[PDB]
Amino acid sequence: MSKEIPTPYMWSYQPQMGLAAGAAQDYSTRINYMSAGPHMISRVNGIRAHRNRILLEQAAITTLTIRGRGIQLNDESVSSSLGLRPDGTFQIGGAGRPSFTPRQAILTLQTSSSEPRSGGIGTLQFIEEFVPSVYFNPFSGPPGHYPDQFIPNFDAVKDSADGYD
């Protein structure tokens, strides 16, 4: 309500694309003090101010035996045991000792993707980045100066995405 101690706005996540959907004022955690006197009402307003101070600030400032993949594996290069190879004479029966070659096997097992991505955001980074945002003087500018990110039906490039096509 008050343009100085405003109820905060809480973002909504779209898991599927990784972008952040529209947000809204928090409407599930409001305190109903409509049956209180000036004392508790001032106390509650001070509490909400403290909460807003916590939010603003937070947001602004805070932004051998390799483990393999959780089960370590040993590593040997000269562990070659069966030195024979079947020439015209020999006939090698069942064999095989699985050993990770130091350079070939391990590096080929831990290479990253060929080219890094460029798109949406995962859940953890969304939680760390999109804290609830406190909007102080709501919509106080001329048309076009409003925060359009809040409306979920608004597309950044093509403005005001017409629902239903």
Binding site: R103, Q104, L107, T108
Partner: protein
């Protein structure tokens, strides 16, 4: 870490296939080549047998495995 030695050699040069070939297909928008191109009440005998022969064999254009045939022109049925 080079796997060229595994490939067939087309003569001093590995036969490395195009990297742009990894499968993707769904219900609509995905189309693949090699389409379904194709007591006689009637005794003609002739064209009949011939037609049966035709029915069991094939022809198209991207069938370019190996060679198209001598002098040329580029054509359709892509």
């Amino acid at each position: 870490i080079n796997f060229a030695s595994l490939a067939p050699r087309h003569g001093s040069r590995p036969f490395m296939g195009n990297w742009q070939d990894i499968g993707t297909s769904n219900m609509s928008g995905g189309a693949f080549s090699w389409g379904s191109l194709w007591k006689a009440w009637n005794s003609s005998t002739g064209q009949m047998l011939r037609d049966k022969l035709k029915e069991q064999n094939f022809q198209q254009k991207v069938v370019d495995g190996l060679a198209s045939g001598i002098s040329g022109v580029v054509d359709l049925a892509n």
